[PDB]
């Protein structure tokens, strides 16, 4: 009689395990055969992707206050067959390898073998997690409802999907290319998308645009940071006309097309180097306990920041910390020079911490974001470092 109760019981049966992280801000519900070690890898993978995303997008403040994605729920069925039950249990399409629903802040997927998918669970999760990030920090309103989806519902599709594919390759220090994506790009240059074709792609065009959107995102990151910056700026601002104008300009630009084509050629040539950047074993090791005060002191030295705030959070297998500070640029040399300065500096800080004796520093992720000019017209950034404090 009580259908809702029966459904809750079914969820409990198929997803009997619950793992919580970050003082309850990440909840993972999973089948009894999904390994705890895998669950932990996904948590640390999420921090690598998060940090690269904030570095590039330049914002770590949710665009809206009080959305469902204040809590990220991850639902992992045991296998592809049990995943089909998600249509009945939760109500969402199971015709995919997983799906993120912004309105409930929930990603649904399943553990799988290499014979069931090209994509390992961590690889797929790293892609789909970026939809969560895009929904929260980059695209105003909800998916298929905000102003970016009105009128021309596919105007952002090439970027939303292409950038998700790209950010899946995040590491502690960069975003690296993915074999699964590069391998699909045509060996024949004449069959590859040009910029105009990509930048107007929609879901109804088929699925080739995902790989070419991936490649265009890697092209921007490595060779056209200004366009990447300019696009994300229009998105954060809900500036649909600005975005559209930028797409039209970029679609007709022969230098962008030449450089994009060259970049694809280089990706294809370097295919063997592009094994998916999955998280290191460094995250699973036990280390000595080290105090927050000492961690703060080391990070302040490595990054040249002062008066930082460090705070502990609890997960069920370990405690973590976030250190927050600001950094003021001695010299303003324009957007892209500043970006590179900060990206290099933050990576040098991570390298210095890595070279210290405490192994816990190998778990650290870091970003800079939200630049603004102070009263003396100096550029100030927010800085955040995240790391393991102690295993339980
Ligand atoms: Ca959103
Ligand atoms: Zn996607």
Residue numbers in the entry: 339 to 730
Published text:
Clostridial collagenases are among the most efficient enzymes to degrade by far the most predominant protein in the biosphere. Clostridia employ collagenases for nutrition (e.g. saprophytic strains) and host colonization (1–3). They are large multidomain proteins of ∼115 kDa belonging to the gluzincin superfamily of metalloproteases. Here we present the crystal structures of the peptidase domains of ColH and ColT and the collagenase unit of ColG in the presence and absence of the peptidic inhibitor isoamylphosphonyl-Gly-Pro-Ala bound to the active site.
The peptidase domains of ColH (Q46085; Pro330–Gly721; 46 kDa) and ColT (Q899Y1; Asp340–Lys731; 46 kDa) showed sequence identities of 56 and 55% and sequence similarities of 71 and 74%, respectively. The stabilizing interactions of the helper subdomain with the upper segment and, to a lower extent, with the lower catalytic segment are reflected by their contact areas of 1060 and 418 Å2 for ColG, 1046 and 347 Å2 for ColH, and 955 and 503 Å2 for ColT. The upper and lower segments form a 959-, 1115-, and 1359 Å2 contact area, respectively. Consequently, the contact area between the upper and lower catalytic subdomains is larger by 42% in ColT than in ColG. Similarly, the lower catalytic subdomain has more than 20% stabilizing interactions with the helper domain, together suggesting a considerably more rigid quaternary arrangement within the peptidase in ColT as compared with ColG and also ColH. This difference might point toward different substrate specificities in these enzymes; alternatively, the PKD domain(s) present in ColG/H might compensate for the additional quaternary stabilization found in ColT. As evidenced by the comparison of Ca2+-unloaded (ColG) and -loaded (ColH/T) crystal structures, the liganding glutamate side chain undergoes a marked rearrangement upon Ca2+ binding that allows Ca2+ coordination. Due to its location between the two catalytic helices, calcium binding braces the upper and lower half-domains of the peptidase and stabilizes thereby the zinc coordination. Notably, the peptidase domain of ColG from C. histolyticum showed a higher structural similarity to ColT from C. tetani than to ColH from C. histolyticum.
